[PDB]
Design a binder for this molecule. Structure first.
Ligand SMILES: COc1ccc(S(=O)(=O)N(CC(C)C)C[C@@H](O)[C@H](Cc2ccccc2)NC(=O)[C@@H]2CN(c3cccc(C(C)=O)c3)C(=O)O2)cc1
Lengths: 99, 99
């Protein structure tokens, strides 16, 4: 789809058979999701944002289907204010900015 | 133009004879610029992201040129690491997300 920006670019994602809303976030290097359980090994990581730095858990090679488009990659889980899809997965689903 | 997201979507902006690089950020409701002493009236505001909140100063009707495209609207000025062009201005320069 083409998505205009008069509203937040919120889409439905499927991850581990669960549906969530997440924000398509071109200003985010990394995809960060709110607290949830995912299987497999994770590694402790810290990441910065506008308000300071937070601890997250890093899960690798996680399938997410984002508004119908399949990605498999890194998902950080932690105290993000909202589920964000970052450039690491936006590139996988072919997402570009156009004007 | 079309901007892929392999790297951060940085572009040159102009705000009164300051040229700065800024993120075209679909995950940002509002435009947030690094500390600068803009003329005119402003109001204090708090905005939240990863790590928590920062205090910003909200200026209205500020003309900003983004990649040669004209915009004018609200800009929030405060202690951000990066200049962020938010949805309030992205719409004015005709920016969409596509995949
Ligand atoms: C009301 O208007 C608002 C406008 C913008 C924000 S936001 O910036 O918190 N953020 C909102 C989002 C998290 C829901 C926009 C993101 O795109 C944000 C932009 C950004 C902020 C600070 C530094 C870089 C980018 N992105 C992020 O929070 C993360 C943080 N980040 C990053 C990467 C590397 C190093 C850093 C450092 C050193 O801070 C940050 C990154 O790539 O994405 C909040 C409110």
């Amino acid at each position: 789809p083409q998505i205009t920006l008069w509203k937040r670019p919120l889409v439905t994602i499927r991850i581990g058979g669960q549906l969530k809303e997440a924000l398509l976030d071109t200003g985010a290097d990394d995809t960060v999701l709110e607290e949830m359980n995912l299987p497999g090994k994770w590694k402790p990581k810290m990441i910065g944002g506008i308000g300071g730095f937070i601890k997250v858990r890093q899960y690798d090679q996680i399938p997410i289907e984002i508004c119908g488009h399949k990605a498999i990659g890194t998902v950080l889980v932690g105290p993000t204010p909202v589920n964000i899809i970052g450039r690491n997965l936006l590139t996988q689903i072919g997402c570009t900015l156009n004007f």
